Amino acid sequence: GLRRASFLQRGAWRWLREAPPAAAFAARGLLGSGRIDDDRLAAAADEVLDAFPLLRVNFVDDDGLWMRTRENADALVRSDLRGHPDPQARCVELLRADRDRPTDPERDPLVRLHLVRLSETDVVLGVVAHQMLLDARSRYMVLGAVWQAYYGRFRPAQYRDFAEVADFHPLDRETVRVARHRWWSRRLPALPVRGPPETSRLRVPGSRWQALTEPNGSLAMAALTAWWLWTQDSLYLSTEVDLRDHLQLGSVVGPLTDRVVFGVDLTGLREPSFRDLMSRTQAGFLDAVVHYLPYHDVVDLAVDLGVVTPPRVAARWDVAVHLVSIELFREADLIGDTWDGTDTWDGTTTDLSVGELGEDMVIVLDQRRSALLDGLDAAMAQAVADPSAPLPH
Protein backbone atom coordinates (compact mmCIF):
# COMPACT_ATOMS: atom_id res chain seq x y z
CA GLY A 1 0.00 0.00 0.00
CA LEU A 2 2.48 2.62 -1.20
CA ARG A 3 1.32 5.21 -3.72
CA ARG A 4 3.88 7.17 -5.74
CA ALA A 5 4.38 10.81 -4.73
CA SER A 6 3.17 13.62 -7.00
CA PHE A 7 5.43 16.01 -8.92
CA LEU A 8 4.94 18.88 -6.45
CA GLN A 9 5.69 16.53 -3.56
CA ARG A 10 8.80 15.23 -5.33
CA GLY A 11 9.85 18.80 -6.07
CA ALA A 12 9.44 20.18 -2.56
CA TRP A 13 11.18 17.11 -1.13
CA ARG A 14 14.33 18.09 -3.03
CA TRP A 15 14.94 21.07 -0.74
CA LEU A 16 12.86 20.09 2.31
CA ARG A 17 14.89 16.93 2.95
CA GLU A 18 17.98 18.81 4.14
CA ALA A 19 16.13 21.77 5.64
CA PRO A 20 14.90 21.77 9.25
CA PRO A 21 11.60 19.80 9.37
CA ALA A 22 9.76 22.81 10.80
CA ALA A 23 10.37 24.69 7.54
CA ALA A 24 7.77 22.48 5.86
CA PHE A 25 5.06 23.42 8.35
CA ALA A 26 2.46 26.17 8.42
CA ALA A 27 -0.36 27.02 10.82
CA ARG A 28 -3.84 28.44 10.20
CA GLY A 29 -6.96 28.52 12.36
CA LEU A 30 -10.68 29.28 12.53
CA LEU A 31 -12.15 31.05 15.56
CA GLY A 32 -15.53 29.79 16.74
CA SER A 33 -17.69 31.88 19.05
CA GLY A 34 -20.90 30.86 20.81
CA ARG A 35 -22.21 27.77 22.58
CA ILE A 36 -19.73 25.11 21.45
CA ASP A 37 -19.68 21.45 22.48
CA ASP A 38 -15.98 20.53 22.69
CA ASP A 39 -16.56 16.77 22.60
CA ARG A 40 -18.82 17.17 19.58
CA LEU A 41 -16.19 19.30 17.85
CA ALA A 42 -13.45 16.83 18.81
CA ALA A 43 -15.51 14.01 17.32
CA ALA A 44 -15.97 16.07 14.17
CA ALA A 45 -12.20 16.47 13.82
CA ASP A 46 -11.66 12.72 14.10
CA GLU A 47 -14.31 12.19 11.42
CA VAL A 48 -12.49 14.49 9.00
CA LEU A 49 -9.10 12.95 9.81
CA ASP A 50 -10.66 9.61 8.88
CA ALA A 51 -12.46 10.68 5.70
CA PHE A 52 -9.27 12.15 4.24
CA PRO A 53 -6.56 9.44 4.14
CA LEU A 54 -4.16 12.08 2.80
CA LEU A 55 -4.05 13.68 6.24
CA ARG A 56 -2.82 10.36 7.65
CA VAL A 57 0.04 10.08 5.17
CA ASN A 58 3.73 9.59 5.91
CA PHE A 59 6.57 9.60 3.37
CA VAL A 60 9.09 6.90 2.51
CA ASP A 61 12.32 8.01 0.86
CA ASP A 62 13.56 4.72 -0.56
CA ASP A 63 13.83 3.92 -4.28
CA GLY A 64 12.05 7.23 -4.89
CA LEU A 65 9.44 9.10 -2.86
CA TRP A 66 6.33 7.21 -1.74
CA MET A 67 3.16 7.83 0.27
CA ARG A 68 2.08 5.59 3.15
CA THR A 69 -1.36 5.76 4.76
CA ARG A 70 -1.24 5.54 8.55
CA GLU A 71 -4.11 3.57 10.08
CA ASN A 72 -4.46 5.55 13.31
CA ALA A 73 -4.61 9.35 13.08
CA ASP A 74 -3.34 10.37 16.54
CA ALA A 75 -3.45 14.00 15.43
CA LEU A 76 -6.07 15.67 17.62
CA VAL A 77 -4.52 17.89 20.29
CA ARG A 78 -6.81 19.47 22.89
CA SER A 79 -5.74 22.52 24.89
CA ASP A 80 -7.32 25.05 27.27
CA LEU A 81 -6.01 28.60 27.75
CA ARG A 82 -8.68 30.05 30.05
CA GLY A 83 -6.07 30.55 32.77
CA HIS A 84 -4.32 33.21 30.70
CA PRO A 85 -5.43 36.89 30.78
CA ASP A 86 -4.86 37.12 27.01
CA PRO A 87 -5.95 33.70 25.64
CA GLN A 88 -5.78 34.76 21.98
CA ALA A 89 -2.13 35.81 22.14
CA ARG A 90 -1.32 32.47 23.76
CA CYS A 91 -3.18 30.50 21.10
CA VAL A 92 -0.95 32.07 18.45
CA GLU A 93 2.14 31.19 20.47
CA LEU A 94 0.74 27.67 20.87
CA LEU A 95 0.26 26.98 17.16
CA ARG A 96 3.62 28.56 16.33
CA ALA A 97 5.28 26.35 18.94
CA ASP A 98 3.71 23.17 17.60
CA ARG A 99 4.66 24.32 14.11
CA ASP A 100 8.32 24.62 15.07
CA ARG A 101 8.39 21.15 16.64
CA PRO A 102 10.67 18.72 14.73
CA THR A 103 8.54 16.09 13.01
CA ASP A 104 9.70 12.78 11.52
CA PRO A 105 7.96 12.73 8.12
CA GLU A 106 8.15 8.93 7.97
CA ARG A 107 6.58 8.18 11.36
CA ASP A 108 4.79 11.12 12.97
CA PRO A 109 1.43 12.70 12.05
CA LEU A 110 2.08 15.50 9.54
CA VAL A 111 -1.34 17.12 9.94
CA ARG A 112 -2.24 18.12 13.50
CA LEU A 113 -5.64 19.54 14.42
CA HIS A 114 -5.72 21.77 17.49
CA LEU A 115 -8.88 22.34 19.53
CA VAL A 116 -8.03 25.33 21.73
CA ARG A 117 -10.62 26.81 24.09
CA LEU A 118 -9.99 30.47 24.95
CA SER A 119 -13.06 31.27 27.05
CA GLU A 120 -16.65 30.23 27.76
CA THR A 121 -17.66 31.23 24.23
CA ASP A 122 -14.46 31.18 22.15
CA VAL A 123 -12.80 28.08 20.68
CA VAL A 124 -9.99 28.05 18.11
CA LEU A 125 -9.76 25.18 15.64
CA GLY A 126 -6.23 25.22 14.26
CA VAL A 127 -4.28 23.13 11.78
CA VAL A 128 -0.52 22.58 11.71
CA ALA A 129 0.43 20.81 8.50
CA HIS A 130 3.34 19.71 6.32
CA GLN A 131 3.25 21.61 3.02
CA MET A 132 3.60 18.37 1.03
CA LEU A 133 0.15 17.37 2.27
CA LEU A 134 -1.76 20.65 2.47
CA ASP A 135 -1.19 23.87 0.54
CA ALA A 136 -2.57 27.30 1.49
CA ARG A 137 -6.11 26.59 0.29
CA SER A 138 -6.28 23.01 1.60
CA ARG A 139 -5.64 24.13 5.18
CA TYR A 140 -8.89 26.10 5.25
CA MET A 141 -10.68 23.36 3.33
CA VAL A 142 -9.80 20.93 6.12
CA LEU A 143 -10.69 23.43 8.85
CA GLY A 144 -13.98 24.16 7.11
CA ALA A 145 -14.71 20.46 6.76
CA VAL A 146 -14.39 19.97 10.52
CA TRP A 147 -17.01 22.64 11.22
CA GLN A 148 -19.19 21.08 8.53
CA ALA A 149 -19.01 17.75 10.36
CA TYR A 150 -19.91 19.53 13.60
CA TYR A 151 -23.30 20.44 12.14
CA GLY A 152 -23.66 17.22 10.15
CA ARG A 153 -23.07 19.00 6.85
CA PHE A 154 -19.86 17.19 5.93
CA ARG A 155 -20.23 15.07 2.79
CA PRO A 156 -16.98 13.37 1.66
CA ALA A 157 -18.30 12.91 -1.88
CA GLN A 158 -18.44 16.69 -2.23
CA TYR A 159 -14.63 16.65 -2.21
CA ARG A 160 -12.30 15.03 -4.73
CA ASP A 161 -9.67 12.64 -3.36
CA PHE A 162 -6.05 13.61 -4.08
CA ALA A 163 -5.41 10.03 -5.19
CA GLU A 164 -7.18 10.82 -8.47
CA VAL A 165 -4.68 13.57 -9.31
CA ALA A 166 -1.53 12.25 -7.63
CA ASP A 167 -0.29 11.01 -11.01
CA PHE A 168 -1.40 14.24 -12.70
CA HIS A 169 1.20 16.42 -14.42
CA PRO A 170 0.51 19.59 -16.46
CA LEU A 171 3.34 18.49 -18.78
CA ASP A 172 2.21 14.91 -19.34
CA ARG A 173 2.89 15.16 -23.08
CA GLU A 174 6.59 14.96 -23.89
CA THR A 175 6.32 17.35 -26.85
CA VAL A 176 4.93 19.91 -24.41
CA ARG A 177 7.57 19.19 -21.77
CA VAL A 178 10.42 19.60 -24.26
CA ALA A 179 8.96 22.90 -25.46
CA ARG A 180 8.65 24.31 -21.94
CA HIS A 181 12.16 23.09 -21.12
CA ARG A 182 13.42 24.84 -24.24
CA TRP A 183 11.59 28.09 -23.49
CA TRP A 184 13.22 28.35 -20.06
CA SER A 185 16.64 27.15 -21.26
CA ARG A 186 16.79 30.13 -23.61
CA ARG A 187 15.75 32.70 -20.99
CA LEU A 188 17.46 31.60 -17.75
CA PRO A 189 20.97 32.70 -18.78
CA ALA A 190 19.67 36.16 -19.70
CA LEU A 191 18.26 36.82 -16.22
CA PRO A 192 19.87 39.96 -14.73
CA VAL A 193 22.20 39.66 -11.73
CA ARG A 194 20.95 40.57 -8.25
CA GLY A 195 21.83 41.28 6.68
CA PRO A 196 19.45 39.43 9.06
CA PRO A 197 15.72 39.13 8.26
CA GLU A 198 13.55 41.86 9.79
CA THR A 199 9.75 42.11 9.79
CA SER A 200 7.58 45.14 9.08
CA ARG A 201 3.78 45.34 8.90
CA LEU A 202 1.27 47.61 7.17
CA ARG A 203 -2.38 47.30 8.15
CA VAL A 204 -4.66 48.04 5.20
CA PRO A 205 -8.39 48.73 5.65
CA GLY A 206 -10.41 45.92 4.06
CA SER A 207 -12.21 48.37 1.80
CA ARG A 208 -8.89 49.61 0.41
CA TRP A 209 -7.75 46.07 -0.33
CA GLN A 210 -10.99 45.14 -2.12
CA ALA A 211 -11.01 48.18 -4.42
CA LEU A 212 -7.42 47.34 -5.32
CA THR A 213 -7.85 43.57 -5.63
CA GLU A 214 -11.26 43.33 -7.29
CA PRO A 215 -10.96 44.62 -10.88
CA ASN A 216 -4.95 39.16 -9.36
CA GLY A 217 -4.93 40.14 -5.69
CA SER A 218 -1.23 39.36 -5.40
CA LEU A 219 -0.71 40.92 -8.83
CA ALA A 220 -1.46 44.41 -7.56
CA MET A 221 1.16 43.68 -4.91
CA ALA A 222 3.68 42.41 -7.44
CA ALA A 223 3.17 45.50 -9.60
CA LEU A 224 3.55 47.95 -6.72
CA THR A 225 6.46 46.10 -5.11
CA ALA A 226 8.27 46.06 -8.46
CA TRP A 227 7.45 49.75 -8.81
CA TRP A 228 8.97 50.80 -5.50
CA LEU A 229 12.11 48.71 -5.96
CA TRP A 230 12.39 50.44 -9.34
CA THR A 231 12.28 53.87 -7.66
CA GLN A 232 14.02 52.78 -4.43
CA ASP A 233 15.72 47.18 -17.50
CA SER A 234 13.63 44.46 -15.84
CA LEU A 235 12.95 42.85 -12.45
CA TYR A 236 12.14 39.20 -11.71
CA LEU A 237 9.69 38.11 -9.02
CA SER A 238 8.17 34.92 -7.65
CA THR A 239 4.54 34.18 -6.78
CA GLU A 240 2.34 31.14 -6.16
CA VAL A 241 -0.35 29.73 -8.44
CA ASP A 242 -3.23 27.43 -7.46
CA LEU A 243 -3.50 24.74 -10.13
CA ARG A 244 -7.11 24.06 -9.12
CA ASP A 245 -8.34 27.32 -10.65
CA HIS A 246 -5.85 27.44 -13.51
CA LEU A 247 -6.19 23.83 -14.68
CA GLN A 248 -9.77 23.21 -13.54
CA LEU A 249 -8.85 20.44 -11.12
CA GLY A 250 -11.69 19.81 -8.69
CA SER A 251 -12.12 20.76 -5.05
CA VAL A 252 -9.10 18.64 -4.16
CA VAL A 253 -7.52 18.62 -0.70
CA GLY A 254 -3.78 18.35 -1.26
CA PRO A 255 -0.59 19.92 -2.68
CA LEU A 256 -1.67 21.66 -5.89
CA THR A 257 0.03 25.04 -5.48
CA ASP A 258 3.24 25.88 -7.32
CA ARG A 259 5.52 28.90 -7.76
CA VAL A 260 6.05 30.72 -11.05
CA VAL A 261 8.93 33.07 -11.91
CA PHE A 262 8.07 36.11 -14.04
CA GLY A 263 9.71 39.38 -15.03
CA VAL A 264 8.35 42.92 -15.01
CA ASP A 265 9.83 45.03 -17.81
CA LEU A 266 10.53 48.47 -16.33
CA THR A 267 12.50 49.79 -19.31
CA GLY A 268 10.81 52.96 -20.57
CA LEU A 269 9.01 54.05 -17.40
CA ARG A 270 8.69 57.80 -16.77
CA GLU A 271 6.10 58.97 -14.24
CA PRO A 272 4.30 55.64 -14.53
CA SER A 273 0.72 55.06 -13.40
CA PHE A 274 -0.73 51.98 -11.72
CA ARG A 275 -2.12 50.99 -15.11
CA ASP A 276 1.35 51.25 -16.63
CA LEU A 277 2.90 48.87 -14.11
CA MET A 278 -0.17 46.63 -14.03
CA SER A 279 0.12 46.20 -17.79
CA ARG A 280 3.78 45.21 -17.63
CA THR A 281 3.33 42.96 -14.59
CA GLN A 282 0.43 41.10 -16.18
CA ALA A 283 2.36 40.66 -19.44
CA GLY A 284 5.27 39.04 -17.63
CA PHE A 285 3.10 36.85 -15.41
CA LEU A 286 0.83 35.48 -18.14
CA ASP A 287 3.89 34.86 -20.31
CA ALA A 288 5.34 32.67 -17.55
CA VAL A 289 1.98 30.98 -16.97
CA VAL A 290 1.50 30.20 -20.68
CA HIS A 291 4.96 28.61 -20.73
CA TYR A 292 4.55 26.95 -17.33
CA LEU A 293 7.33 24.74 -15.99
CA PRO A 294 7.28 23.44 -12.38
CA TYR A 295 9.36 25.60 -10.02
CA HIS A 296 11.53 22.66 -8.99
CA ASP A 297 12.16 21.85 -12.66
CA VAL A 298 13.11 25.49 -13.23
CA VAL A 299 15.47 25.44 -10.24
CA ASP A 300 17.14 22.23 -11.41
CA LEU A 301 17.52 23.75 -14.87
CA ALA A 302 19.01 27.01 -13.61
CA VAL A 303 21.54 24.97 -11.65
CA ASP A 304 22.69 22.91 -14.64
CA LEU A 305 23.07 26.05 -16.76
CA GLY A 306 25.23 27.48 -13.96
CA VAL A 307 22.89 30.41 -13.42
CA VAL A 308 22.48 29.76 -9.69
CA THR A 309 24.32 27.76 -7.02
CA PRO A 310 22.55 25.86 -4.20
CA PRO A 311 21.15 26.80 -1.86
CA ARG A 312 20.94 30.31 -3.36
CA VAL A 313 18.53 29.12 -6.07
CA ALA A 314 16.34 32.24 -5.97
CA ALA A 315 19.15 34.80 -6.25
CA ARG A 316 17.99 35.81 -9.74
CA TRP A 317 14.37 36.18 -8.64
CA ASP A 318 14.86 37.33 -5.05
CA VAL A 319 11.47 39.00 -4.64
CA ALA A 320 8.62 36.79 -3.42
CA VAL A 321 4.97 37.82 -3.34
CA HIS A 322 2.50 35.40 -1.78
CA LEU A 323 -1.24 34.66 -1.99
CA VAL A 324 -22.06 29.87 16.04
CA SER A 325 -19.91 32.64 14.57
CA ILE A 326 -16.89 31.50 12.54
CA GLU A 327 -14.05 33.77 11.41
CA LEU A 328 -10.38 33.51 10.48
CA PHE A 329 -8.08 33.50 13.50
CA ARG A 330 -5.14 35.93 13.52
CA GLU A 331 -4.10 34.95 10.00
CA ALA A 332 -1.71 37.92 9.87
CA ASP A 333 0.16 36.64 12.92
CA LEU A 334 0.17 32.97 11.92
CA ILE A 335 1.75 33.75 8.55
CA GLY A 336 5.48 33.21 9.10
CA ASP A 337 19.46 30.75 15.02
CA THR A 338 22.19 28.33 16.13
CA TRP A 339 25.98 28.04 16.00
CA ASP A 340 27.36 26.50 12.79
CA GLY A 341 23.78 26.00 11.64
CA THR A 342 23.08 24.66 8.17
CA ASP A 343 22.43 27.56 5.79
CA THR A 344 19.42 26.78 3.59
CA TRP A 345 18.38 30.34 2.68
CA ASP A 346 17.28 30.48 -0.97
CA GLY A 347 18.46 34.05 -1.52
CA THR A 348 15.12 35.85 -1.36
CA THR A 349 15.74 39.34 0.00
CA THR A 350 12.22 40.78 -0.17
CA ASP A 351 9.39 38.56 1.04
CA LEU A 352 5.85 39.94 0.97
CA SER A 353 2.75 38.20 2.34
CA VAL A 354 -0.83 39.29 3.07
CA GLY A 355 -3.08 38.03 5.87
CA GLU A 356 -6.47 38.89 7.36
CA LEU A 357 -6.89 40.64 10.70
CA GLY A 358 -10.45 41.55 11.62
CA GLU A 359 -12.04 43.28 8.64
CA ASP A 360 -8.58 44.44 7.58
CA MET A 361 -5.68 43.03 5.57
CA VAL A 362 -2.15 43.09 6.96
CA ILE A 363 0.88 43.16 4.69
CA VAL A 364 3.78 41.31 6.33
CA LEU A 365 7.19 42.24 4.92
CA ASP A 366 10.38 40.23 5.44
CA GLN A 367 13.52 42.03 4.25
CA ARG A 368 17.29 41.58 4.17
CA ARG A 369 18.98 44.92 3.45
CA SER A 370 9.71 50.21 6.30
CA ALA A 371 10.28 52.86 3.64
CA LEU A 372 8.86 50.22 1.31
CA LEU A 373 5.63 49.99 3.28
CA ASP A 374 5.15 53.77 3.32
CA GLY A 375 5.66 53.62 -0.44
CA LEU A 376 3.11 50.86 -1.01
CA ASP A 377 0.62 52.64 1.27
CA ALA A 378 0.70 55.85 -0.76
CA ALA A 379 0.76 53.98 -4.06
CA MET A 380 -2.27 51.88 -3.11
CA ALA A 381 -4.30 54.96 -2.21
CA GLN A 382 -3.36 56.47 -5.56
CA ALA A 383 -4.18 53.27 -7.45
CA VAL A 384 -7.74 53.30 -6.12
CA ALA A 385 -8.20 57.07 -6.45
CA ASP A 386 -6.93 57.35 -10.03
CA PRO A 387 -5.15 54.40 -11.70
CA SER A 388 -4.29 56.67 -14.65
CA ALA A 389 -2.49 59.27 -12.53
CA PRO A 390 1.30 59.10 -12.06
CA LEU A 391 2.47 57.26 -8.95
CA PRO A 392 4.58 59.27 -6.41
CA HIS A 393 7.70 60.78 -8.00
Side-chain angles (χ1 to χ4, degrees), residues 1-213 215-336 338-339 341-393:
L2 272 74
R3 191 174 188 87
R4 197 67 162 90
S6 67
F7 76 106
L8 289 177
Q9 288 176 321
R10 262 178 276 116
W13 184 241
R14 287 187 174 94
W15 73 276
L16 278 177
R17 185 175 46 82
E18 283 169 319
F25 279 81
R28 300 297 143 90
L30 292 180
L31 170 59
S33 190
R35 306 193 200 277
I36 303 172
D37 197 347
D38 284 348
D39 296 314
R40 181 64 196 95
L41 182 58
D46 289 325
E47 179 179 342
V48 175
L49 289 181
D50 172 270
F52 289 110
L54 173 63
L55 304 179
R56 293 176 280 113
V57 157
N58 291 93
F59 295 96
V60 178
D61 187 22
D62 179 82
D63 193 41
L65 192 61
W66 303 84
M67 278 171 51
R68 183 187 194 88
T69 305
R70 202 173 60 258
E71 299 182 317
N72 289 12
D74 190 72
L76 180 57
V77 180
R78 307 183 61 168
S79 299
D80 196 317
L81 305 183
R82 279 180 288 184
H84 300 283
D86 192 347
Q88 296 202 354
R90 309 290 85 87
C91 187
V92 172
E93 296 158 354
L94 183 145
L95 296 177
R96 281 179 176 182
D98 187 82
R99 180 196 63 192
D100 301 339
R101 189 162 52 89
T103 313
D104 193 355
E106 70 196 347
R107 295 186 307 182
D108 315 328
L110 302 181
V111 174
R112 295 165 231 131
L113 296 184
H114 292 260
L115 200 156
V116 193
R117 175 166 287 273
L118 310 184
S119 58
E120 301 304 313
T121 61
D122 288 22
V123 175
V124 169
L125 179 78
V127 57
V128 180
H130 197 287
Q131 67 163 84
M132 286 180 51
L133 291 192
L134 307 180
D135 53 15
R137 181 175 180 176
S138 295
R139 301 189 209 103
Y140 285 115
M141 295 188 71
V142 172
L143 289 178
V146 177
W147 281 111
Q148 280 189 349
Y150 180 81
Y151 283 116
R153 313 201 173 192
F154 177 70
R155 298 188 302 186
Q158 202 83 353
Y159 302 86
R160 187 182 184 191
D161 199 324
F162 177 76
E164 301 184 5
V165 297
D167 306 335
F168 175 75
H169 200 293
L171 309 182
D172 202 75
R173 278 203 298 138
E174 180 71 5
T175 52
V176 179
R177 206 217 96 253
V178 172
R180 305 294 176 84
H181 191 271
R182 249 199 62 209
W183 192 90
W184 281 95
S185 289
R186 176 185 269 93
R187 283 165 184 78
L188 283 179
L191 259 56
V193 183
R194 270 176 59 93
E198 49 190 347
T199 296
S200 308
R201 295 179 186 85
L202 173 66
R203 195 190 69 212
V204 168
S207 183
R208 175 70 50 79
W209 184 257
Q210 291 302 321
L212 185 74
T213 293
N216 193 80
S218 67
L219 231 52
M221 283 295 98
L224 288 178
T225 299
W227 162 79
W228 191 84
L229 298 180
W230 166 74
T231 65
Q232 312 147 229
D233 195 41
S234 68
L235 179 72
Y236 279 79
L237 288 69
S238 172
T239 188
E240 288 108 49
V241 163
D242 194 342
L243 300 181
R244 296 174 183 83
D245 300 325
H246 179 241
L247 291 185
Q248 278 70 46
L249 312 180
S251 50
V252 176
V253 170
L256 289 179
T257 303
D258 195 26
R259 288 173 287 178
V260 300
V261 178
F262 65 101
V264 184
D265 188 14
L266 313 157
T267 298
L269 294 179
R270 281 159 297 164
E271 310 182 3
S273 66
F274 177 69
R275 270 198 178 91
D276 286 325
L277 290 136
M278 202 59 249
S279 167
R280 309 191 172 203
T281 301
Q282 182 175 329
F285 178 76
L286 292 176
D287 198 23
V289 171
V290 162
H291 305 90
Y292 170 73
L293 184 72
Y295 185 81
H296 62 88
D297 284 319
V298 169
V299 163
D300 293 334
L301 182 55
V303 164
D304 297 342
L305 303 176
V307 177
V308 294
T309 78
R312 305 281 187 272
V313 296
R316 305 289 267 269
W317 49 81
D318 60 344
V319 179
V321 180
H322 304 289
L323 195 84
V324 171
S325 176
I326 296 179
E327 63 187 21
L328 270 58
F329 176 67
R330 297 280 183 88
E331 187 178 54
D333 292 332
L334 285 175
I335 289 177
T338 67
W339 169 268
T342 305
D343 186 20
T344 66
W345 172 53
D346 63 5
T348 304
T349 57
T350 301
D351 197 283
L352 202 145
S353 183
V354 191
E356 279 199 14
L357 194 77
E359 294 89 81
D360 300 327
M361 295 293 269
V362 175
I363 300 178
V364 184
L365 172 69
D366 296 316
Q367 282 219 107
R368 305 194 184 214
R369 206 85 68 178
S370 177
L372 193 154
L373 292 190
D374 288 293
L376 290 187
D377 187 24
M380 277 183 293
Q382 182 62 76
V384 177
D386 195 352
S388 295
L391 292 178
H393 289 45

